[PDB]
Design a protein around this ligand. Sequence first.
Ligand SMILES: CC(C)C[C@H](NP(=O)(O)CNC(=O)OCc1ccccc1)C(=O)NC[C@@H](C)C(C)(C)C
Ligand SMILES: [Ca+2]
Ligand SMILES: [Ca+2]
Ligand SMILES: [Ca+2]
Ligand SMILES: [Ca+2]
Ligand SMILES: [Zn+2]
Length: 316
Amino acid sequence: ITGTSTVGVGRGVLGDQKNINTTYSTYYYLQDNTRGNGIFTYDAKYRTTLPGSLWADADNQFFASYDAPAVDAHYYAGVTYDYYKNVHNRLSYDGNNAAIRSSVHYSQGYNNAFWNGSQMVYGDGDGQTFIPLSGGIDVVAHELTHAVTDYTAGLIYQNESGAINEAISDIFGTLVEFYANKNPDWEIGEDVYTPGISGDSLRSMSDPAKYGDPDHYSKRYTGTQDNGGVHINSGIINKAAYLISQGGTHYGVSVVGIGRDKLGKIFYRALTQYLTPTSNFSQLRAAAVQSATDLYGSTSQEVASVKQAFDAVGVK
Ligand SMILES: CC(C)C[C@H](NP(=O)(O)CNC(=O)OCc1ccccc1)C(=O)NC[C@@H](C)C(C)(C)C
Ligand SMILES: [Ca+2]
Ligand SMILES: [Ca+2]
Ligand SMILES: [Ca+2]
Ligand SMILES: [Ca+2]
Ligand SMILES: [Zn+2]
């Protein structure tokens, strides 16, 4: 909408106060004009028709319980935009400052979040498996990264390419969480998963097997559920990425860590210059090796560590 840029204040899902960029024209809208061609957050009003209505508020204060998922979807989309722009010189998900749209309060009791081809969508959870999913910065960044993938490599959402697609979203979700630097970890979704259970998470990148996901290619899922295991087999790639960054010895194979920033550079280059819609795990290894070679040189520690990490997870 046309209006003047304003700064509201509110509380997110976890109870934390934050400032949010809004737009004033009669109402204060969740429309952040400070980033690209805008970040826009919508109310789906417990229904499934999208996007719903652009979030309108009378007083620019967002402290109601109903407001909290909107505050966080809006704010964490901004953090994710900043990560891609400042770290990778990428302007929004399409590279040309496309408007970023999110809807919250999608459906009833909805234990998921997704990119629908055009926008991000967040359930409120049922209060048992999830609380409102936009409360997780890694979750928000995971969703926006699906849009990045779709505009770049275009990894088909099934089987190995789909597990790579998933892992890319978990990797960059985690790197955005570290960028913001509030309680960062290598776990996925811990801030919004299972409010009655402390210390767990939806997935672990450091130890995928803690939640039953494979940490070696020989343990990959080969059935048809979950689009051929896209949220399961992602563990193999998540573990490789974790090892590249942090190092470790896994199934007897030692990996020298090179840190998160270099992990992000390698995987961003692989995603945007080498992967294709049909890339499989072996082709991801080759893309990561080539990316590290481009950035650091063929004789570099970074190339050697990429090879060690894929060896450790059984991907040749
Ligand atoms: C980061 C996480 C909190 C949320 C993330 N959402 P996502 O990976 O983004 C789900 N996405 C999804 O299933 O997309 C299918 C689709 C939708 C629309 C158009 C085309 C395809 C995700 O991992 N969901 C699976 C969990 C909830 C399980 C338990 C596997 C059902
Ligand atoms: Ca208000
Ligand atoms: Ca965390
Ligand atoms: Ca996390
Ligand atoms: Ca929990
Ligand atoms: Zn996903």
